[PDB]
Design a protein around this ligand. Structure first.
Ligand SMILES: Cc1ccc(NC(=O)NCc2ccc3c(c2)CN([C@H]2CCC(=O)NC2=O)C3=O)cc1Cl
Ligand SMILES: [Zn+2]
Lengths: 380, 1080, 195
């Protein structure tokens, strides 16, 4: 096997960039103005990493000066139907940056990380091809436990337990002690358990484990956003989760998709299977999916999968600008429709694990719920 | 949409309970918190003294004596962090010495909950509200605004904290938990520096230690209770016992028996009461099993070995604990039971004229049905088996107070003498006893009178005997007679005579003739003798008034139809009414003119199809008793106000005032005479049907005249139960399947509606959890069915993947299982939907048609984002909700055979209950004990939030229904609660909402609020915090009636009252608020 | 080693300028200097203001050379280690991103070609295979020409002689910018070297 921390550090971008420790979060419900870079179209999730390559001096200006102050710019969710009425989005904060003029056009490569969700109020258009967006921060809306309302005061003293050994009787125990006072309400322990952040996160962990070898956030907010970015879903569904204001509802709806969406199809010709859930695994620490930039500055949320069907390969394996040090890429396209689905990755050393695997772009895919037995998914 | 919220049953459940000297230094009091209410009793070997209401959930309540104060003061801290210090004042005020809201801008509320403590020297109140901080209020004489300061805690997870006794500076002892384990520590609280100083001692305690007990100052020190171990600490003395007798469960409440601290009471989580003893200084500990009580939330030792058990899950108690333990068993015995409806976990409204409410109340051994009927109760002092009474009269064998009861049967009469409480048959000399008596009584000129069918009979009192008789001039039968102190008017069918009463003579006067055969008469005076007459004729079916001697009465109001049975002139408040009651059960009630003659301001109301009889009686003013299938008392406050009487039918009555039964009543039906005193006025009467297991749902099958109840019980592993339950003691019982650490076993009960016997217990499948229950007809099938929704629950499988919809039917004495459907998930709810069955299975809604092959055939299927936990309907609409407070409006489209989402509002907060108010409005209970309302009115697929209100209770159920007979306000929803409060919600016109909103504000200036908490702070929607809206607190409006006349005028001072507009008076409001009180 | 020579300022016996892009360079270390295969020993290494005896990549050397060729050496030659020395000749293939152009560049387009120190006029003799930017996807057909904002692979003759390396094989000496009317009109990694 191979070093899973390598792909998330985007070493293919260049050796060292100036790094920025942290620190800027804007307090909730505020009204901010943030620049939005043009041509970047991606629905960006808190905690997700975003690599960029900027070519136009418009963009290259906007950033060079952005570094001095805030370092954060604005990324927009568009339903394609919007045609510019962008209505929600996400702050991304630059944590790494490099400005090369070697080739002899000036090129700016950056690594940003999604920070906050906002609502669009207005969009004003600096005639420099850049937007500056009037933007109200959305608070992550946090709920106490389901029991904190109905809890007998005498049993408060029992609500903290000794912490879990690092094995599932513990969860039966957990359920029995935490949701004891269900008897005062009109539902069972096992229901209140289906809205328990701690439980849901654990149920999600087990699926993520299948991806293998896992640690990660303890806060449900972060966890829910981390698995949100792992989910290969479609830009219209991705805006839905993002719009969702509870961690609990995020985790729940997220478990739904992971069970309900076994197959992954050619998005263009629709009724062709490329790959399955079975085949997804996390080459990157960050998930079975991350964002990667290519050399022409195009962004690819690519999904690492072990086999996959109904593709052609064109050309020969190349390590040029490869996102996965150790592997070469060959362009993959839909056997039927020719529409470019991703890449097949191939080892250059015979002592690496996965000798081959597919990396499939999310733009090229359509998650399906198998059958015509309730077959357009709605997140739950 | 604008709504009125009012309480119909105050919360019953006990939060907390304390003793000490509050009312008076010499008295010993018990102070009890029942959520928003505070009861004050004086102990004797409990006399209620004062009960009041916080604008608050009482969350801490302690008594304490500051230096140089004459009795104890009372600290309350509410769930909204409203502090106050309170004094009793002698007629009685509870006054607020000090108050302040001790909220902080930052601060995560602690997982272990709010914890209030007062040190023994009364230096400070110590508050633990948030993790990391310990708040201190100095008790300095000059701290009226309870200003306070925080001390940082390194330790973030504090389990429990107490001040210690016998320290040279105030000292806290607490248990906390971190990664290295659980530990007890102490701090010295430096009053001056406002910091902790390294405490006298510390110590890794038991893993699950959770209770701190501070021992008073002979031994001083602390006791620490866990699961297995009880441990004592002071400095570096240390005792640790681990007795088996507390192995089985968890000690959750405690209390000191004596000042010494020799003895402590300890309460189990499942109903054991223990005594802990400290042996002497401190050398050993022994715990001893007193027995079983209601599951205790809090305990107080009172005196003479009597103990108050405050319950939440069950009825609260008084228990006597003997040092004689019986071989009945261990040593505790019940003295009193105090009703607790708490957990109202589900309910339904039944029955046919004035509806009554049945609940699933309690939990584990405390599980019960509660039946709640609005009512005037009657305390019985005698019942006598005495069939056939057809009239009743009190009488006085001596000139003062009745001593004689006269009863009539068909063509027969008989006399009872009363000596104290012993009734004995006698003869009255002068009274014929072989005819039926129509009236008798004491009369004018030291005399007596019997009016039979035959004759009208004047009798003397000193040497009793018949001084004059009157019969018809043609020796005929009397049909109907009416007599007062001085006069008689007797009818003979068609025509009728007026008679007087002088000594030895009853001499005739007027001998008139009527349209048709007179059916009822009256002569009740309004000033010694009645110058007027009430009549009712057989065939013109009319209530006529006539002049005396003359008889040309006039104002002869021909009501419609059926013959009149009774008629009466009487006086409520001071207005004068005429009442005429029909043989169909109707009752017409007109205005009267004693001096004018006109009968007017007509209203009419029905009481029950069996013909009605009307009597006057005193209980200090005058009311009317109305006998029929449903007996009714009448008053009054300038409405006449019918009030059902808590009794099976009363055929006849009279007032009865004896040396044995003073200011009492005599009630006769077909087979019994009853003598009783009668409560004024109507309260909620609760009948309690113990099940000894947890009831979970209830619904009503009217044709089977019985209830279905889902319930569950706890067995321990082979599986075999911990006690006899409803479900183990049914007459007939079934099981879903044969036998081919605690467990939960679900049952459907069939409870009789009359006897509340458990007729049948069905047991569902092993692992099968019964979720939903419902009674209804389906398709075109005349049968009514019980229908259960289940879900198959395994611990390994976190989401339910299979469940049943089962159709039962109860005919004869047998429960048949008629039809099943397996379904690939949980059936969280069901609801009858236009003769189809609508069920929510996970996040699908499914509508089933009921075939003739007698099976459910899926018609349609709708998937939502939301799990469908709540379902309700009206007309074509479906209201769907989930735990998270997300709501969906759905519409059945008959021409498409299909469902359609109409509106939705996802607004993430814990939701406990929903209801439809009408096509356009939706009620909900939501986190931090709130109510809210959604409204319907493209972008018409958005629901608007038009109402919020901080209730103070956690609603488990809404249900349409009332508890006052049929019929200002519009519609009615009742709601049931964890604390055992029952409420009512109803709509107001925008006119009344505006008026009552003004009123609230004006009543706020006038009413004294207990902790000096502002009403609007209290009602303000809480989790976020916003002002309350679109709700009117009827609890507040109704208190208008309790303030003094000058305060009433204060409140109405500058108001435009609204009809046809002008300066509003106290009287305009008194009548408005009274109409308002009449909706429960 | 590899030092693209910027200029020769005959001084002393002789001397030469550059940035030193492959390897370390020891005082008196016999070398060669390309297309012409001229031997030469380092005499003098006046790196930066300072002299040092040996010096590693990055630095800015002037170097006194002794050889049969002592001016008559031009910029866009390079020094080379004699073992693995530098590839060269005058045709080559490369991947050439068109950044600025009004119309449609197309084979037998003439332009200037700045590779490292060298600056020789060049023709793209044919172009080869288009390539789409989103993918990597080489192209199916040949392309008759390449417009702006677009990538191709193409073969290139310098109307004299160069000293190339392939990108990957080397980078600083195989990235290069076509340039015309003093604008930058493409940029290109060199791939092969033809004959
Ligand atoms: C000045 C210049 C500019 C660009 C290029 N390279 C190109 O045009 N090169 C064509 C090219 C275009 C797009 C992509 C690639 C190569 C490779 N690739 C993915 C494959 C999977 C991976 O792991 N990393 C990726 O980036 C692309 O999206 C050369 C020069 Cl000299
Ligand atoms: Zn395709």
């Amino acid at each position: 096997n191979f070093d899973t921390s390598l792909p998330t550090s985007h070493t293919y971008l260049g050796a060292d960039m100036e790094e920025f420790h942290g620190r800027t979060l804007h307090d909730d419900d505020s009204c901010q103005v943030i620049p939005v870079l043009p041509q970047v179209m991606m629905i960006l999730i808190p905690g997700q990493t975003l690599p960029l390559q900027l070519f136009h001096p418009q963009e290259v200006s906007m950033v060079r000066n952005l570094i001095q102050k805030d370092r954060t710019f604005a990324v927009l969710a568009y339903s394609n139907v919007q045609e510019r009425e962008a209505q929600f989005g996400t702050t991304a904060e630059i944590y790494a940056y490099r400005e090369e003029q070697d080739f002899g056009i000036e090129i700016v490569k950056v690594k940003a990380i999604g920070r906050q969700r906002f609502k669009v109020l207005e969009l004003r258009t600096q005639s420099d091809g850049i937007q500056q967006a009037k933007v109200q921060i959305l608070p992550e809306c946090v709920l106490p436990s389901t029991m904190s309302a109905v809890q007998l005061e005498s049993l408060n003293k029992c609500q903290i337990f000794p912490s879990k050994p690092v094995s599932y009787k513990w969860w039966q125990k957990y359920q029995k002690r935490k949701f004891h006072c269900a008897n005062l309400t009109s539902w069972p322990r096992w229901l209140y358990s289906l809205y328990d952040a701690e439980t849901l996160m654990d149920r999600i962990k087990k699926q993520l484990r299948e991806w293998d070898e896992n640690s990660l956030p303890s806060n449900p907010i972060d966890f829910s956003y981390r698995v949100a970015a792992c989910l290969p879903i479609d830009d219209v569904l991705r805006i839905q989760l993002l719009k969702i204001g509870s961690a609990i509802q995020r985790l729940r709806c997220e478990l739904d998709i992971m069970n309900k969406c076994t197959s992954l199809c050619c998005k263009q010709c629709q009724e062709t299977e490329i790959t399955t859930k079975n085949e997804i695994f996390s080459l990157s620490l960050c998930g079975p999916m991350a964002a990667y930039v290519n050399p022409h500055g195009y962004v690819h949320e690519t999904l690492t999968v072990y086999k996959a069907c109904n593709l052609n390969l064109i050309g020969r394996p190349s390590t040029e600008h490869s996102w996965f040090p150790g592997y070469a890429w060959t362009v993959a396209q839909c056997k039927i429709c020719a529409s470019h689905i991703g890449w097949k990755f191939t080892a250059t050393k015979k002592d690496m694990s996965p000798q081959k695997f597919w990396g499939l772009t999310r733009s090229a895919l359509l998650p399906t719920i198998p059958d015509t037995e309730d077959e357009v998914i709605l997140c739950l | 949409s604008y709504n009125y919220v009012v309480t119909a049953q105050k919360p019953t459940a006990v939060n907390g309970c304390v003793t000490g000297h509050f009312t008076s230094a010499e008295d010993l009091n018990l102070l009890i918190a029942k959520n928003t209410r505070l009861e004050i009793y004086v102990v004797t070997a409990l006399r209620p003294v004062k009960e009041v209401g916080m604008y608050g959930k009482i969350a801490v309540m302690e008594l304490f004596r500051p230096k140089g104060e004459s009795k104890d003061l009372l600290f309350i801290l509410t769930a909204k962090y409203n502090a106050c210090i309170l004094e009793y004042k002698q007629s009685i005020d509870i006054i607020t010495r000090a108050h302040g809201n001790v909220q902080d801008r930052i601060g995560r509320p602690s997982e272990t909950g709010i914890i209030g403590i007062i040190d023994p020297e009364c230096r400070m109140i110590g508050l633990r509200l948030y993790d990391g901080l310990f708040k201190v209020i100095p008790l300095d004489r000059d701290n009226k605004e309870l200003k306070a300061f925080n001390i940082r805690l390194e330790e973030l997870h504090v389990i429990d904290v107490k001040f210690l006794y016998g320290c040279q500076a105030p000292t806290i002892c607490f248990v906390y938990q971190d990664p290295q384990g659980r530990h007890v520590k102490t701090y010295e609280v430096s009053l001056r520096e406002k910091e902790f100083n390294k405490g006298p001692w510390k110590q890794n305690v038991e893993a699950e230690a959770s209770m701190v007990i501070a021992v008073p100052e002979p031994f001083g020190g602390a006791i620490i209770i866990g699961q297995e171990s009880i441990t004592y600490h002071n400095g570096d003395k240390y005792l640790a016992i681990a007795p088996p007798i507390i192995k089985q469960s968890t000690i959750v409440c405690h209390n000191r028996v004596d000042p010494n601290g020799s003895r402590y009471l300890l309460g189990d989580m499942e109903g054991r009461l223990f005594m802990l003893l400290l042996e002497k200084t401190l050398k050993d500990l022994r715990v001893e099993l007193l027995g079983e009580t209601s599951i205790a939330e809090c305990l107080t030792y009172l005196d003479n070995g009597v103990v108050f058990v405050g319950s939440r899950l069950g009825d609260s108690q008084l228990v006597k604990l003997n040092v004689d333990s019986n071989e009945q068993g261990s040593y505790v015995v019940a003295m009193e039971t105090f009703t607790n409806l708490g957990p109202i976990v589900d309910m339904c409204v039944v029955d046919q004229g004035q509806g009554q409410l049945v609940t699933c109340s309690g939990a584990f051994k405390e599980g019960s049905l509660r039946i709640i009927r609005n009512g005037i109760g009657i305390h019985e002092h005698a019942s006598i088996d005495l069939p056939g009474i057809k009239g009743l009269w009190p009488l006085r064998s001596d000139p003062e107070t009745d001593d004689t009861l006269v009863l009539s049967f068909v063509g027969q009469t008989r006399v009872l003498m009363l000596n104290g409480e012993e009734v004995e048959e006698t003869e009255l000399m002068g009274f014929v006893d072989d005819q039926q008596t129509f009236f008798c009584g004491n009369v004018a000129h030291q005399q007596l009178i019997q009016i039979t069918s035959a004759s009208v009979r004047l009798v003397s009192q000193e040497p009793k005997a018949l001084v004059s008789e009157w019969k018809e001039p043609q020796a005929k039968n009397i049909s109907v007679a009416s007599c007062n102190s001085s006069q008689v008017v007797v009818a003979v069918g068609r025509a009728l005579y007026y008679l007087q009463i002088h000594p030895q003579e009853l001499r005739q006067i007027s001998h008139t003739e009527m349209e048709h055969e007179v059916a009822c008469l009256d002569i009740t005076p309004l000033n010694g003798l009645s110058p007027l007459c009430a009549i009712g004729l057989w065939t013109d079916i009319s209530a006529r008034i006539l002049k005396l001697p003359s008889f040309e009465l006039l104002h002869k109001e021909m009501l419609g139809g059926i013959i009149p049975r009774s008629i009466l002139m009487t006086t409520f408040e001071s207005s004068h009414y005429l009442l005429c009651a029909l043989g169909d059960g109707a009752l017409f009630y007109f205005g009267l003119n004693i001096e004018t003659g006109l009968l007017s301001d007509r209203k009419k109301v029905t009481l029950g199809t069996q013909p009605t009889v009307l009597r006057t009686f005193r209980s200090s003013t005058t009311n009317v008793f109305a006998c029929s299938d449903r007996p009714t008392v009448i008053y009054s406050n300038h409405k006449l106000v019918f009030s059902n009487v808590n009794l099976k039918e009363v055929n006849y009555m009279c007032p009865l005032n004896s040396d044995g039964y003073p200011d009492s009543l005599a009630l006769a039906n077909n087979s019994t005479l009853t003598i009783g005193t009668i409560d004024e006025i109507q309260k909620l009467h609760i009948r309690t049907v113990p099940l000894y297991e947890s009831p979970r749902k209830i619904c009503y099958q009217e044709v089977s005249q019985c209830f279905g109840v889902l319930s569950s019980r706890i067995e321990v592993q082979d599986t075999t139960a911990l006690r006899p339950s409803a479900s183990t003691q049914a007459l007939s019982s079934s099981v879903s399947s044969s036998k081919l650490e605690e467990v939960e076993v679900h049952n459907l009960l069939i409870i009789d509606q009359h006897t509340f016997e458990v007729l049948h217990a069905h047991q569902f499948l092993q692992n099968e959890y019964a979720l939903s229950l419902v009674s209804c007809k389906l398709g075109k099938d005349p049968n009514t069915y019980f229908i259960v929704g289940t879900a198959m629950v395994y611990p390994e499988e976190a989401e339910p993947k299979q469940g049943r919809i089962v159709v039962f039917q109860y005919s004869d004495g047998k429960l048949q299982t008629v039809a099943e459907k397996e379904v690939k998930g949980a059936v969280y709810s069901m609801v009858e939907f236009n003769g189809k069955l609508l069920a929510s299975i996970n996040s699908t809604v499914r509508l089933y048609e009921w075939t003739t092959e007698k099976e459910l055939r899926t018609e349609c299927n709708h998937y939502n984002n939301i799990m469908a936990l709540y379902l309700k309907t009206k007309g074509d609409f479906i209201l769907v909700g989930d735990l998270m407070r997300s709501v969906l409006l759905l519409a059945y489209k008959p021409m498409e055979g299909n469902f359609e989402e109409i509106a939705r509002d996802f607004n993430p907060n814990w939701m406990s209950a929903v209801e439809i108010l009408d096509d356009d409005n939706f009620l909900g209970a939501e986190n931090a004990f709130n109510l809210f309302v959604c409204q319907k009115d493209e972008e018409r697929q958005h629901l608007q939030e038009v109402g919020l209100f901080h209730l103070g209770e956690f609603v488990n159920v809404f249900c349409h229904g009332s508890l006052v007979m049929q019929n200002p306000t519009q519609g009615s929803v009742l709601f049931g609660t964890v604390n055992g409060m029952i409420g009512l919600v109803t709509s107001l016109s925008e006119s009344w909402y505006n008026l009552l909103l003004d009123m609230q504000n004006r009543l706020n200036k006038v009413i004294k609020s207990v902790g000096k908490i502002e009403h609007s702070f209290w009602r303000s929607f809480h989790t976020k915090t916003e002002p309350a809206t679109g709700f009117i607190d009827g609890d507040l409006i109704e208190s208008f009636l309790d303030i003094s006349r000058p305060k009433m005028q204060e409140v109405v001072a500058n108001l435009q009252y609204d009809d046809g507009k002008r300066e509003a008076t106290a009287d305009d409001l008194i009548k408005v608020v009274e109409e308002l009180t009449r909706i429960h | 080693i590899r030092l693209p020579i910027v200029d020769k300022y005959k001084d002393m016996g002789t001397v030469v300028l550059g940035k030193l892009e492959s390897g370390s360079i020891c005082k008196g270390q016999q070398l060669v200097m390309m297309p012409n295969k001229h031997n030469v020993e380092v005499l003098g290494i006046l790196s930066d203001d300072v002299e040092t005896d040996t010096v590693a990549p990055g630095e800015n050397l002037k170097i006194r050379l002794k050889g049969i060729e002592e001016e008559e050496i031009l910029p866009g030659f390079i020094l080379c280690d004699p073992n693995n020395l530098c590839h060269s000749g005058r045709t080559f293939d490369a991947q050439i991103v068109i950044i600025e152009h009004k119309s449609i560049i197309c084979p037998g387009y003439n332009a200037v070609l700045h590779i490292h120190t060298c600056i020789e006029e060049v023709e793209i003799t044919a172009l080869i295979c288009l390539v789409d930017k989103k993918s990597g996807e080489k192209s199916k057909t040949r392309p008759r020409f390449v417009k702006q904002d677009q990538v191709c692979i193409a073969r290139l003759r310098t109307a004299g002689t160069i000293c190339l390396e392939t990108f990957k094989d080397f980078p600083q000496m195989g990235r290069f910018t076509l340039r015309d009317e003093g604008k930058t009109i493409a940029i290109g990694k060199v791939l092969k070297l033809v004959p």
